[PDB]
Write an enzyme that holds these catalytic residues in place. Structure first.
Site, short mmCIF file in Angstrom:
data_model
loop_
_atom_site.label_atom_id
_atom_site.label_comp_id
_atom_site.label_asym_id
_atom_site.label_seq_id
_atom_site.Cartn_x
_atom_site.Cartn_y
_atom_site.Cartn_z
N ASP A 103 -8.89 3.91 -3.19
CA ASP A 103 -9.95 4.22 -2.22
C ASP A 103 -11.19 4.84 -2.85
O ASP A 103 -11.37 6.05 -2.80
CB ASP A 103 -9.41 5.11 -1.10
CG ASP A 103 -8.23 4.47 -0.36
OD1 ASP A 103 -8.00 3.25 -0.48
OD2 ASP A 103 -7.46 5.14 0.36
N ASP A 145 0.87 -1.19 0.00
CA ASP A 145 0.00 0.00 0.00
C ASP A 145 0.89 1.21 0.00
O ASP A 145 2.10 1.10 0.32
CB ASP A 145 -0.88 -0.02 1.24
CG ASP A 145 -2.11 0.83 1.12
OD1 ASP A 145 -2.30 1.56 0.10
OD2 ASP A 145 -2.96 0.84 2.02
N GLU A 154 3.24 6.59 -2.63
CA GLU A 154 3.17 7.78 -3.49
C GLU A 154 3.69 9.15 -3.00
O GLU A 154 4.39 9.82 -3.73
CB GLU A 154 1.86 7.93 -4.30
CG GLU A 154 0.49 7.42 -3.89
CD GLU A 154 0.34 6.21 -2.96
OE1 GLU A 154 -0.15 5.15 -3.45
OE2 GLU A 154 0.53 6.37 -1.72
#
EC number: 3.2.1.177
Lengths: 773, 773, 260
Positions: free
Chosen positions: A482, A416, A419
């Protein structure tokens, strides 16, 4: 980035210079170098006191032309660089004549016009497919910020649309839009992306990669309406034109060049269930879910532990919360004995509360500021620091932690985040922070994937990765992030997934039912159909569980029906997945990629092809109304068996066990005989299904082995009213349904039984011939 | 303007506050006011030290709901404002309940949810067409530049596409783009626009006008992918949602609201020809062209003198160059005697070199800076200044120059420029310079229009206007500006034309063969076909003449063919023109506006409906290949008489005397008996053409009088194999042709005769019954 | 005020435009107007999107040629103005030919060359006493400080020395010095002057009055060594060339013009 101010003026403070005239052409072995002046230099008096561009044309792969336009070569130009596969011996041709300098690789060439009228044209066997008009490339000196840029604008013809640029959630076709390739944590509802890739392709059958890991600012018909403009803060600009002439052939060269999607294990194609994010979970909650799935006869293949498997505020330290999970190894063995693979959440950051932070700070394993202190903020975790993966010992330390989890039974990782990489920093290896921002996602996922490869084995390696950069497609499963629990967000997710396949990624998942918010049952139900007709299917949410019974009774039936269906599709599906690995053809394909000659397909983004042969159109309305376009042919619904004439739009209404799932004509499709799991012996009990074989056509079906190679090939060829069927390889107990065919004239080397779907033939003797009435 | 930073964050230095909770509702006669707190204020302790928003709902016209959301009322709020038609007395319903505050006008309501879950919803008959979710509107205090803004974001559903926002040259469908409504002189090839309108509409059948003449910043699915966001630097935001529920119905209301296009004189519909721009021209060049046309049998109806009718560097001082044009009045008289109308170039600026400049500076007629000096720059003309049209004496002076030209034989004006209006000034009337930027184009065109109205008369008034702003559709003919001579620019011009009609404008021309550069003959030929199939048709160039013989012989055949054609379609065309005046239905219509229920039309931008019944697809290739989609029905070529089935795409090839021009079924079409001129007795000699009348259908054909009213109505009704034709009103000497019908069982009250298009029937005694075979 | 940076370059942030080509000549009674383009405007296509200078030649007294070079006429331009004695009917000759536009008062003319090679020359009976070479006058847009200036440079010949510019205490001959005409209280020991006058004269027997009571910034062979440069913050430059041909005769005309 705005350069011109309209057609006539330039942005205030910008000074521009362009290559306007060829001065000299030099062939350097297999590379063509053009020196180009920003004004007329035919006379010696003008051969000084002027800038000069150096353009270099080269070919790293057949049918790929590299174009490097330089201003100053004395810049630092530190890495990292994209993980490009660059051959040295590509067969090229260089022709230097009075009129033109022309560099050719395969069918693709770049041609520069000498003399008064500059032009850069990209030609496919001598026809212009795009190019750069005079003054549409060069050097921008921004006197407002003292930043300097290189730019290019490549032409778009009448009706030419643009796709790709990463997993993006705006309109599918890019014309009119600005895009900056810069990884961000922005959700799925904005112009931002977790997975940026400066590669686009067009409906003209070519692609272009802009070879810069720092931010590339694209204006896709958003500054010059008939051009794709890209600019970058650099003293040189390098980009590759990639020939097709079809989207799939463009993607084949692109993935040969930057990386082939790996072939995930068959098990990962099953259903994933999650703990959810900020819900409660201990061992008991996990088992309750898993037993709840089994009791309702809902197959389940992978189980995922989200963030709270670790202690709060210590995330990324790899320590099991001992008060929630006292015996992790023992818990995990129990899960495995219930038929599950296990995934756990990780990321590449660590909060300060973790007892481990101080060890990592002392060892120098965390991203540092130029003064030597740690880079920290309080987003995500308090006092969060970032693992510095340019430090070889830091990579080892994190890899050993992951090896530890595999040794404890963990089968894969959800990689996850990755970024929000800051630029006001000093990397251990001295890297350009502007280039690392995006490239970090690649180095991160590479380190994790290699751990899997060195423990469970390459064939068993799979991830669930949020961010990405050029080349990260070698480390499959990418999930769409998300999303919200509503139809609009479901549609935006699909646009992202179509875009990612258009950008070199073969596999793609998304959170069934939405991540944030609780879906009303109808929404959850439509989304279940969509997620299970995607390459990878995961039930996951932010604040609520994603078990079907929590929505309504019918949701259990929907999950059941679609999970069973997907497991039965595996013979077909896994073969299509081998195609992603071999050719970079993603499993979920935009209509335009599969039917590039059909003008009705250019803007289609609410439906897709799942592999070569089946069109799926998710239902995005409670009432079940859906409209979709079908290309030329007679199409047949995968299980309803109803037929539709193609090359037009259709309107239908579907209840929750249904959606348009249509099989194209001249298709021979394999369904397996196990509806409980994805990973089984596909080539035994195989139920082949032949759809509308036309006179003069042949249908081919290749059943894969577990490693993706073809273990069996079945062909059905129609000459008159005679369909000859030949099988080659290894297969047992298989059958052939002649879809929508109730009665045959004759049958040689086979027996025939009946069904709702049509006549079913069992072979014996092999040669097997069928004569139509 | 970017407000969020992905899903989670806000742009640095921006502070936001939103209406989150209804605190109080108050009906004020026919308006509803909602006071909304940016936080929970149920308790008195929080009913202080907080901002409060004031929303006012009102209806200026049936089925338009006005929404005004205010932060501080103490701002200056100077004019100008848009020329809106506001009624005081519209009948509305206001329900103030426990759950909701609801304001309804016609079928359209605005509903606000009270209590914990704020929601602003727009409903048609109680169904949600759009709306603003909580935190998607409010105030932005920009702490970086000390500026404050109001914003809204109105939802977009799955498959909801956005159109309009003025005459723009980017992709037709706005989803994905940033647009700033700010007039600019930027050509036709960029994101800029001479003609900005802060009005958009969607394929869901509603429109919205953001009622701010200053720059409105639209982020159309470009910040939040499923909302259209608009923001404005202001202490209040005001917008109107306009019900349809079709695009045509939206436009009907929008133009009722903001202004109906005027019906231009029949003569304006003929072929216009120009001097071209920086070419050479005197009386003999002009005569040379008029005669060159006549020699070649090329009908010509309007001649235009461009900029060099005046002395260089003296532009818009209205003095004929005495060395080029020694006797203006005499020259006009000679040119008009051969039947021509005359147009001359004008603009609203003036160069310092003109003797008249000093006159204007002494009198205070020119735009000043705050310190009292003239505003001047060197763009366009040296020491260029701007006519201050807020100064009543200035307006009279300029209007008097215009009356001067009219009196001398000038029929009409090309109102060029008007977009680069500076803001660092002080208008005579003290208007807000930010609102004047765009509103200038309106004031300028209105003044010129009113001169024509007051001299030649309303029915005779026409203009050729480059810039526009809300309301300017009342002063028709707008042309697409400075386009280039190639197919991509032909295509972009078309997107511009489609778009302007989607923003309220009924009539639209462009430069045939391109303004800048010299087209290859083949481009010129294709563009002629397009040009003469648009509401208004003009040959005009930058650096070269646009006489067809400047290109090749065949070009003259193309000009003749399509000029003749257009003159013949005038009885149809002028009736479609009255519709623009009546309903705001543009003559050149995007496929989605004419066929709003057909999912294949959402994106079509290379083809159009010219009025209700004819599809035209210009050919954008040399070789003549063209693909186009046809909605449901059996369509017939206007003159080739070949038929095609619709609900699909087609591919054809056409020489230069041809292009797809297809007629819908169930159509009754009036062609005329004059192929030389557009203004004639259309109801005399009329040839009607019936196209594929289906069992149980009626085709109606309304032939107009010179003033646009219906003089004659022909109807053809099919019942079984019997078609009853009934005329009503005034028409003499007319025929009716049964297209693609060779033979007929019987005929009652008419004679028949054979033709190669179908049977030609001449009426005698009314009943005209035709019984088919 | 430094405008160039050596022979080759320009001071950073300065945008220069120059009168380079006669576009039109117009005789207005006893004044000659020359419209002059900063680029080639021979073709119609270039006759727009360009600056344009307006030059006016007139004569306030016999043997004085006034030269007004002008950019924007829209600026404010308030007084005061110098107490100049200006006659409206001085006898002059204006010759507008294919090659030249020549304005003459007594023995002194200004001549502008038409065509490709712009030149502005001051002649005494057809011999050149000084002039302005192409690109040695025009408009300066100062991008650093948002200020705009007009400037001229009049040629100096071999052995030509420059005098005056008020009561100054530096070297008598001015060649090599910068002078700002701005009254100051600086004593007698520095480059400052209590008594500034924007007039100079040379040992070639002419004089020049720069017609600007604001500060005028003179580079007297201190920027271009063989020219006298003056610049002024203004949308126009106006200066008077005052014939001799001796220093005494220049002073006679100068004080007739400005006060005895």
């Amino acid at each position: 980035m705005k350069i011109s101010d309209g057609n006539w003026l330039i942005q205030p403070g910008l000074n521009l210079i362009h290559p306007l005239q060829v001065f000299e052409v030099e062939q350097q072995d297999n590379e063509m170098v053009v020196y180009a002046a920003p004004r007329d230099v035919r006379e010696r008096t003008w051969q000084l006191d002027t800038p000069l561009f150096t353009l270099r044309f080269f070919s790293p792969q057949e049918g790929i032309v590299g174009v490097r336009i330089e201003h100053f070569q004395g810049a630092l130009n530190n890495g990292p660089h994209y993980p490009l596969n660059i051959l040295q011996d590509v067969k090229v041709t260089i022709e230097n004549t009075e009129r033109y300098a022309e560099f050719k690789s395969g069918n693709l060439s770049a041609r520069v016009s000498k003399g008064e009228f500059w032009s850069l044209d990209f030609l496919r066997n001598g026809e212009r497919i795009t190019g750069s008009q005079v003054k549409n490339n060069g050097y921008v000196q921004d006197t407002n910020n003292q930043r300097n840029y290189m730019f290019e604008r490549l032409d778009l013809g009448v009706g030419e649309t643009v796709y790709g640029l990463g997993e993006r959630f705006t309109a599918l076709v890019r014309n009119g839009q600005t895009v900056e390739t810069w990884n961000r944590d922005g959700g799925t509802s904005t112009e931002q992306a977790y997975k940026n890739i400066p590669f686009y392709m067009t409906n003209r059958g070519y692609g272009v990669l802009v070879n810069h890991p720092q931010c590339v600012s694209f204006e896709v018909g958003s500054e010059k309406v008939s051009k794709v403009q890209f600019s970058v803060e650099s003293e040189y600009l390098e980009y590759f034109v990639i020939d097709g002439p079809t989207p799939k052939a463009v993607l084949d060269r692109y993935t040969r060049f930057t990386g082939r999607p790996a072939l995930p294990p068959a098990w990962s194609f099953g259903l994933w269930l999650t703990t959810s994010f900020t819900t409660n979970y201990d061992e008991a909650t996990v088992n309750s879910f898993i037993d709840g799935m089994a009791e309702r006869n809902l197959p389940l293949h992978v189980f995922h532990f989200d963030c709270f498997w670790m202690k709060a505020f210590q995330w990324c330290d790899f320590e099991w919360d001992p008060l929630t999970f006292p015996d992790p190894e023992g818990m995990i063995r129990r899960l495995k004995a219930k038929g599950l693979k296990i995934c756990v959440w990780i990321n590449p950051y660590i909060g300060q509360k973790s007892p481990v932070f101080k060890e990592l700070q002392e060892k120098g394993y965390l991203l540092k500021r130029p003064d030597g202190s740690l880079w920290q903020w309080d987003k995500w975790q308090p006092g969060l620091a970032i693992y510095d993966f340019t430090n070889p010992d830091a990579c080892k330390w994190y890899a050993d932690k992951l090896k530890g989890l595999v040794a404890m039974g963990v089968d894969c990782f959800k990689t996850d985040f990755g970024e929000r990489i800051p630029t006001d920093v000093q990397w251990f290896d001295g890297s350009d922070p502007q280039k690392m921002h995006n490239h970090y996602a690649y180095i991160y996922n590479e380190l994790v994937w290699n751990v899997l490869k060195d423990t469970v084995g390459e064939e068993e390696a799979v991830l669930f990765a949020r961010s990405a950069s050029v080349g990260a497609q070698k480390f499959p499963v990418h999930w769409g992030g998300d999303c919200y629990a509503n139809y609009e967000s479901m549609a935006e997710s699909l646009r992202g997934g179509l875009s990612i396949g258009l950008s070199g990624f073969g596999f793609w998942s998304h959170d069934i039912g939405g991540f944030e918010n609780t879906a009303p049952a109808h929404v959850y139900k439509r989304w279940c159909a969509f997620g299970l007709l995607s390459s990878h299917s995961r039930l996951h949410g932010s604040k609520s569980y994603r078990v079907p019974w929590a929505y309504d009774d019918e949701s259990c039936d929907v999950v059941r029906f679609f999970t069973q269906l997907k497991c039965r599709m595996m013979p077909y599906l896994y073969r299509e997945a081998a195609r992603a690995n071999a050719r970079g053809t993603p499993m979920m394909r935009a209509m335009m990629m599969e039917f590039p000659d059909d003008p009705a397909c250019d803007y289609l983004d609410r439906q897709y092809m799942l592999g070569d042969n089946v069109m799926v159109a998710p239902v995005f309305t409670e009432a079940g109304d859906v409209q979709f376009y079908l290309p030329e042919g007679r199409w047949t619904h995968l299980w309803h068996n109803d037929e539709l004439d193609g090359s037009r739009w259709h309107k239908q209404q579907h209840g929750f066990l249904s959606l348009p799932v249509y099989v194209r004509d001249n298709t021979l499709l394999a369904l397996g005989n196990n509806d409980q799991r994805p990973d089984y012996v596909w080539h035994e009990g195989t139920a082949f299904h032949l759809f509308n074989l036309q006179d003069g056509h042949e249908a081919v079906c290749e059943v894969p082995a577990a490693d993706g190679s073809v273990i069996f090939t079945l062909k059905a060829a129609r000459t008159g009213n005679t369909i000859t069927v030949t099988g080659a390889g290894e297969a047992k107990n298989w059958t052939l349904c002649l879809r929508n065919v109730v009665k045959v004239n004759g049958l040689q080397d086979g027996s025939q039984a009946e069904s709702e779907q049509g006549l079913v033939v069992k072979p014996q003797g092999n040669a097997l011939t069928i004569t139509l009435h």
